[PDB]
Amino acid sequence: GKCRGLRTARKLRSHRRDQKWHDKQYKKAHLGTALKANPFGGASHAKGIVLEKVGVEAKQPNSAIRKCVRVQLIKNGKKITAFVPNDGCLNFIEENDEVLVAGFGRKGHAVGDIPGVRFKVVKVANVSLLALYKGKKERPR
Amino acid sequence: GRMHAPGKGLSQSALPYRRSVPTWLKLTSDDVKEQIYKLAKKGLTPSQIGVILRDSHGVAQVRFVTGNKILRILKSKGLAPDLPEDLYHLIKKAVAVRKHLERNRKDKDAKFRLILIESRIHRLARYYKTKRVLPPNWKYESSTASALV
Amino acid sequence: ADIQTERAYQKQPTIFQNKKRVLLGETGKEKLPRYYKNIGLGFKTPKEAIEGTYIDKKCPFTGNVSIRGRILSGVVTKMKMQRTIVIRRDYLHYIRKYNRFEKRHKNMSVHLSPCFRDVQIGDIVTVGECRPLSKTVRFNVLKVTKAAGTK
Amino acid sequence: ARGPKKHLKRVAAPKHWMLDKLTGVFAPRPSTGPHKLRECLPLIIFLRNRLKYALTGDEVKKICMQRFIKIDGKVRTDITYPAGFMDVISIDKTGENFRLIYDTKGRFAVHRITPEEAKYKLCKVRKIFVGTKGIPHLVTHDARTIRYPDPLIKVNDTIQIDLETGKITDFIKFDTGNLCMVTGGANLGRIGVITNRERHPGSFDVVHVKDANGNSFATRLSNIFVIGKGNKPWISLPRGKGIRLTIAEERDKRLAAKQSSG
Amino acid sequence: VRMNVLADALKSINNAEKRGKRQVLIRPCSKVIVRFLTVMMKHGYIGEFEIIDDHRAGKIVVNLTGRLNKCGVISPRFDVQLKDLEKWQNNLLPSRQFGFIVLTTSAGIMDHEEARRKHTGGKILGFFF
RNA sequence: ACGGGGAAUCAGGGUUCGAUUCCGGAGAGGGAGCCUGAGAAACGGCUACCACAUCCAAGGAAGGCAGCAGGCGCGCAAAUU
RNA sequence: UAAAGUUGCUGCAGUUAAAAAGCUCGUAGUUGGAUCUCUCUCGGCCGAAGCGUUUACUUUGAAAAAAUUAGAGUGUUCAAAGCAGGCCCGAGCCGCCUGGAUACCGCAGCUAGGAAUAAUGGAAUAGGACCGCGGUUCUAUUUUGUUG
Ligand SMILES: [Mg+2]
Ligand SMILES: [Mg+2]
Ligand SMILES: [Mg+2]
Ligand SMILES: [Mg+2]
Ligand SMILES: [Mg+2]
Ligand SMILES: [Mg+2]
Ligand SMILES: [Mg+2]
Ligand SMILES: [Mg+2]
Ligand SMILES: [Mg+2]
Ligand SMILES: [Mg+2]
Ligand SMILES: [Mg+2]
Ligand SMILES: [Mg+2]
Ligand SMILES: [Mg+2]
Ligand SMILES: [Mg+2]
Ligand SMILES: [Mg+2]
Ligand SMILES: [Mg+2]
Ligand SMILES: [Mg+2]
Ligand SMILES: [Mg+2]
Ligand SMILES: [Mg+2]
Ligand SMILES: [Mg+2]
Ligand SMILES: [Mg+2]
Ligand SMILES: [Mg+2]
Ligand SMILES: [Mg+2]
Ligand SMILES: [Mg+2]
Ligand SMILES: [Mg+2]
Ligand SMILES: [Mg+2]
Ligand SMILES: [Mg+2]
Ligand SMILES: [Mg+2]
Ligand SMILES: [Mg+2]
Ligand SMILES: [Mg+2]
Ligand SMILES: [Mg+2]
Ligand SMILES: [Mg+2]
Ligand SMILES: [Mg+2]
Ligand SMILES: [Mg+2]
Ligand SMILES: [Mg+2]
Ligand SMILES: [Mg+2]
Ligand SMILES: [Mg+2]
Ligand SMILES: [Mg+2]
């Protein structure tokens, strides 16, 4: 069992400090490898340049073609696959455009049928996708 | 349980509640002390002296009769060994095991038992150093052990 | 003779030992008057300091030091430097979270005056604070009490 | 810093000045003088906040430059002059005299005194030393140095000084049974009789005081100022005689006063 | 080896209480055990007990009344200030209408309420309810 | 990772934060050396090297916004010359 | 951050769901069986001096920046705030009354009582306590009205 002596504070504290490293989330947050590997580098959003448009096949048992864009970030130059979520919003994005990209909602984990996609497009050409979808603002042009 | 064995025996002695000398015992304190001195001069450890007194002279407990223990009586008289009897027996047993082991190199059990005996010797030596019975430089060494006892 | 071991002459600065006198008083005894002082706080001057002949400018009784500050205690652990020893102070540090304690220790280099002799490893020493005598020494030995095993 | 500091933040000012937070960023830093920065009351604070004579700092300067205010009988034009315990402030234009005495709350009080009383003050002996040619010198709590004092006067005693000539008239010895006021700590502003003194060599001494009502407390030796011999003070006391009330009895007194008002 | 005697005595008493026994034999004896039993008996939880005196550490025979739900010991003996007593009361006692925490103070061995009356702290030994 | 006074969440324990108006420390692009003065190794003082950089009649002269506004750049990210 | 008693000191698990070292010895660390109910002298009952074998613990007391938090008072029209305000006027033409509390501030360091619990201490080769009595050596002050 555990030691219950009156002078065992050092042992208890040292053991807890050493056994906190077997927690997945504590080690992920305090090790530094995840932060280094994160393309955003800890930011909530990022800006990138749309390299191209791609279609990702939805994982089984669902069957569909999810429209995504390959983009390259401006601050570090990494390449990222982002999702354009709406019905027909892929026609609002042109190549070589500048887009704002945020996370998908699961802190770096893939969401839904889309395999290996953890980012989504928020604004394209400095206007929000919601405004374009609802017809409140037009593309600058 | 045992210090170096899994056994958990219960065999021991139970002294009677009464501390008074029995009426039939005719011996006085001085006579018992003289018997103790004669036995010690004969070359007997205090344990053997107590065994002899119990078996032959009807002396159930010397501390009840003379008011003192055998070792303290010997120390007061001056007929006391330099090192305690239990440590002497442990060192003698270690010497015997080591003498056996040198002619039998493949007896791993003897090596295990020798390690246990030497651990007990170290424990007892440290305890006796704490009580200043031994000088704070006395050391048990295998070579010196034969001359020690 | 035995005192004079350095390249410079070892003298007590506040004692004038060249006072001339008649030839009758020279024959009697060449006994220099000793300089000593009471350090206060109830500590008594060891007889070896008053009757001794050693020279030590850092001695609390016959030297030019002042005892003011904290009075602490320790156990003698090492005696290998010249006129200075190393003592150890043990204590317990409290950890609020676990409601328990942990054992901790500190080491102090303190100055030992020649008046204190027969000091062994493992006896209790009461030291007092003074001005920095060296890089690491800030305390001076005031009292020495023997261990429990004294005969 | 590379040298002396010349400003004082308003929130970092002593709390017995009772300054408000939203008036400004700075507070009047007291000038160097007889009293410590943390234990004095600047002239401007007493002149505009306590007495309401001036509304701004400019009006305090306009009053001071007319040479109307006197501290210990001498005209001071400095508006940040450090005025401290047992000091006399005279305004001849309005014919008013005040003495700076702590109240039971530990704040300097507006205590008016008779012009006859305004001619002397009490001082605490801080140092006794013999100077050149074997002349004794006595140093008080307010930086006054007096030559040739009475041989019986020692430290921690009280001397009465005539402000006109600056000479000792008489003195009170520090003995049990005398009247004392606490000038610092948690018991600041309390008045009582000394009961006993505890001596700790190499450390601070502790003195026990008991007030008129029988409440007992203790302080350090440096926080005690002997006011009078026995139960009779040598100065006039403020509205409160130095007895500190508890919160419950302060509430009771306030409610009784409200009930009798109207 | 046996390192706490009060713990063994309290465990024996609790086990015998669960089984519906009328008397309990606890050995070895100790004056701390006697004080704890006296504190329990003053509140009517156990009843009269007798100390059998052999020439080595003694034994105790305790009568049971069936009113004891739980008696236990706290190890290690934690220092308890008078302002931290309510937390121990909340953690260890079942309700605020019954139950007692046993403390050893400089005045003696008593319950938490008697220590509140005498305005003193100490070290926690155990509890019973 | 500037440190505390403190902040968020919290049955009782506890976890996380504190560049930021108060108190201490350090720095003035990076180092180093000084004059004056009670007090500075000061930079809205000086003298050099290192990196940038302004005018020039090519001989020379003059630099330090992590002070208030303001400008470029950087970025998801922050105001009136 | 809580939810997470999924980092468990309070307060988690280790036969089969993840898990106890192949076995033994052993230093450091942690833990450890019962027992034991103020003082002479010198000065004015108290004052000085030694206390306590010492601690740990608990209860006091002193010193402990403001601001924030908790909290008392106060109709910022309420509130978040602030430290302000109230009363009679025949007008006080010397205007009157009153606040600007208190609580907390860990650890370490000071202070005074408690004596349970937990450490440590004494007289065993008696060169151990207490009351006395002779022998020897080394220095200081006072009295022989002063001075050697
Ligand atoms: Mg995983
Ligand atoms: Mg599924
Ligand atoms: Mg489907
Ligand atoms: Mg074992
Ligand atoms: Mg057997
Ligand atoms: Mg806790
Ligand atoms: Mg500055
Ligand atoms: Mg000023
Ligand atoms: Mg930090
Ligand atoms: Mg940094
Ligand atoms: Mg909480
Ligand atoms: Mg909770
Ligand atoms: Mg901060
Ligand atoms: Mg900070
Ligand atoms: Mg930073
Ligand atoms: Mg600087
Ligand atoms: Mg700069
Ligand atoms: Mg810059
Ligand atoms: Mg530069
Ligand atoms: Mg100057
Ligand atoms: Mg510079
Ligand atoms: Mg500048
Ligand atoms: Mg500057
Ligand atoms: Mg700017
Ligand atoms: Mg500019
Ligand atoms: Mg913003
Ligand atoms: Mg911008
Ligand atoms: Mg959490
Ligand atoms: Mg919970
Ligand atoms: Mg988890
Ligand atoms: Mg619980
Ligand atoms: Mg689990
Ligand atoms: Mg398994
Ligand atoms: Mg196994
Ligand atoms: Mg061990
Ligand atoms: Mg025990
Ligand atoms: Mg503070
Ligand atoms: Mg505060």
Swiss-Prot record, chain B:
Question: Residues bearing N6-acetyllysine?
Answer: K26
The annotated crosslink position for Glycyl lysine isopeptide (Lys-Gly) (interchain with G-Cter in ubiquitin) is K26
Family statement: Belongs to the universal ribosomal protein uS15 family.
- Residues bearing N6-succinyllysine? K26, K33
Functional note:
Component of the small ribosomal subunit. The ribosome is a large ribonucleoprotein complex responsible for the synthesis of proteins in the cell. Part of the small subunit (SSU) processome, first precursor of the small eukaryotic ribosomal subunit. During the assembly of the SSU processome in the nucleolus, many ribosome biogenesis factors, an RNA chaperone and ribosomal proteins associate with the nascent pre-rRNA and work in concert to generate RNA folding, modifications, rearrangements and cleavage as well as targeted degradation of pre-ribosomal RNA by the RNA exosome.
Q: What is its main location?
A: cytoplasm
In-chain residues carrying the UniProt-annotated modification Phosphotyrosine? Y37
What name is this protein filed under? Small ribosomal subunit protein uS15
Q: Where is this cross-link: Glycyl lysine isopeptide (Lys-Gly) (interchain with G-Cter in SUMO2)?
A: K42
Q: Name one GO cellular component term.
A: postsynaptic density
Q: How is it modified after translation?
A: Ubiquitinated at Lys-26 by RNF14 and RNF25 in response to ribosome collisions (ribosome stalling).
Query: GO: which molecular function terms?
Result: mRNA 5'-UTR binding; mRNA binding; RNA binding; small ribosomal subunit rRNA binding; structural constituent of ribosome
Matching PANTHER family: RIBOSOMAL PROTEIN S15P/S13E, SMALL RIBOSOMAL SUBUNIT PROTEIN US15
UniProt-annotated location(s):
Cytoplasm; Nucleus, Nucleolus
In this UniProt entry, the residues modified to Phosphoserine are S29
One Pfam family of this protein, by short name?
A: Ribosomal_S15
Its encoding gene is what? RPS13
Q: Subunit structure, per the record?
A: Component of the small ribosomal subunit. Part of the small subunit (SSU) processome, composed of more than 70 proteins and the RNA chaperone small nucleolar RNA (snoRNA) U3.
Q: Where are the transmembrane segments?
A: none
Swiss-Prot record, chain C:
Instruction: Supply one GO molecular-function term.
Output: structural constituent of ribosome
Please give the residue positions where the record annotates the modification N6-acetyllysine: K37, K44, K57
Q: Provide this UniProt record's keywords sorted from A to Z.
A: Acetylation, Citrullination, Cytoplasm, Lipoprotein, Methylation, Nucleus, Palmitate, Phosphoprotein, Ribonucleoprotein, Ribosomal protein, RNA-binding, rRNA-binding
Top-level taxon in the UniProt lineage? Eukaryota
Q: Where in the cell is it found?
A: Cytoplasm; Nucleus, Nucleolus
Q: Where is the lipid attached (S-palmitoyl cysteine)?
A: C59
Q: Can the keyword Cytoplasm be found in this entry's annotation? A: yes
Similarity remark: Belongs to the universal ribosomal protein uS17 family.
Q: Which PANTHER family match?
A: 40S RIBOSOMAL PROTEIN S11 FAMILY MEMBER, SMALL RIBOSOMAL SUBUNIT PROTEIN US17
What is known about its subunit structure? Component of the small ribosomal subunit. Part of the small subunit (SSU) processome, composed of more than 70 proteins and the RNA chaperone small nucleolar RNA (snoRNA) U3.
Q: What is this protein called?
A: Small ribosomal subunit protein uS17
Q: Which organism is it from?
A: Homo sapiens (Human)
Curated annotation (Swiss-Prot), chain D:
Q: Enumerate the Gene Ontology biological process terms.
A: cytoplasmic translation; positive regulation of cell population proliferation; positive regulation of translation; ribosomal small subunit biogenesis; translation
The record lists the organism as Homo sapiens
A GO MF annotation of the entry reads: rRNA binding
Which protein is depicted?
Small ribosomal subunit protein eS4, X isoform
Q: Which UniProt keywords apply?
A: Acetylation, Cytoplasm, Isopeptide bond, Nucleus, Ribonucleoprotein, Ribosomal protein, RNA-binding, rRNA-binding, Ubl conjugation
Q: Where is this cross-link: Glycyl lysine isopeptide (Lys-Gly) (interchain with G-Cter in SUMO2)?
A: K229
Q: What are the subcellular locations of this protein?
A: Cytoplasm; Nucleus, Nucleolus
> Which InterPro entries did the record assign?
KOW (IPR005824), Rib_uL2_dom2 (IPR014722), Ribosomal_eS4 (IPR000876), Ribosomal_eS4_C (IPR032277), Ribosomal_eS4_central_region (IPR013845), Ribosomal_eS4_central_sf (IPR038237), Ribosomal_eS4_KOW (IPR041982), Ribosomal_eS4_N (IPR013843)
Cite the S4 RNA-binding domain residue spans from the record.
Answer: 41-103
User: Does the keyword Transferase belong to this entry?
Assistant: no
**According to its UniProt record, which protein family does this protein belong to?**
Belongs to the eukaryotic ribosomal protein eS4 family.
Q: Gene name, please?
A: RPS4X
The main location is cytoplasm
> Could you name the Gene Ontology cellular component terms for this entry?
cytoplasmic ribonucleoprotein granule; cytosol; cytosolic ribosome; cytosolic small ribosomal subunit; extracellular exosome; focal adhesion; membrane; nucleolus
Which HAMAP family does this one have?
Answer: Ribosomal_eS4 (MF_00485)
- Self-association and partners: Component of the small ribosomal subunit. Part of the small subunit (SSU) processome, composed of more than 70 proteins and the RNA chaperone small nucleolar RNA (snoRNA) U3. Identified in a IGF2BP1-dependent mRNP granule complex containing untranslated mRNAs.
Organism lineage:
Eukaryota, Metazoa, Chordata, Craniata, Vertebrata
Swiss-Prot record, chain E:
Primary location? cytoplasm
Question: Which residues, renumbered to this chain, carry the PTM N6-succinyllysine?
Answer: K87
Q: Which PROSITE patterns match?
A: RIBOSOMAL_S8
Q: What does this protein do?
A: Component of the small ribosomal subunit. Part of the small subunit (SSU) processome, first precursor of the small eukaryotic ribosomal subunit. During the assembly of the SSU processome in the nucleolus, many ribosome biogenesis factors, an RNA chaperone and ribosomal proteins associate with the nascent pre-rRNA and work in concert to generate RNA folding, modifications, rearrangements and cleavage as well as targeted degradation of pre-ribosomal RNA by the RNA exosome. Required for proper erythropoiesis.
The Swiss-Prot or TrEMBL record describes its family as follows: Belongs to the universal ribosomal protein uS8 family.
Q: Which Gene3D superfamilies match?
A: 3.30.1370.30, 3.30.1490.10
Recorded GO cellular component terms are: cytoplasm; cytosol; cytosolic ribosome; cytosolic small ribosomal subunit; extracellular exosome; membrane; nucleolus; nucleoplasm
Q: Could you say which residues form the signal peptide?
A: none
Name its species.
Homo sapiens (Human)
From the Swiss-Prot or TrEMBL record, give the protein name.
Small ribosomal subunit protein uS8
Q: Which PANTHER family match?
A: 40S RIBOSOMAL PROTEIN S15A
Q: Which NCBIfam families does the UniProt record give?
A: PRK04034.1
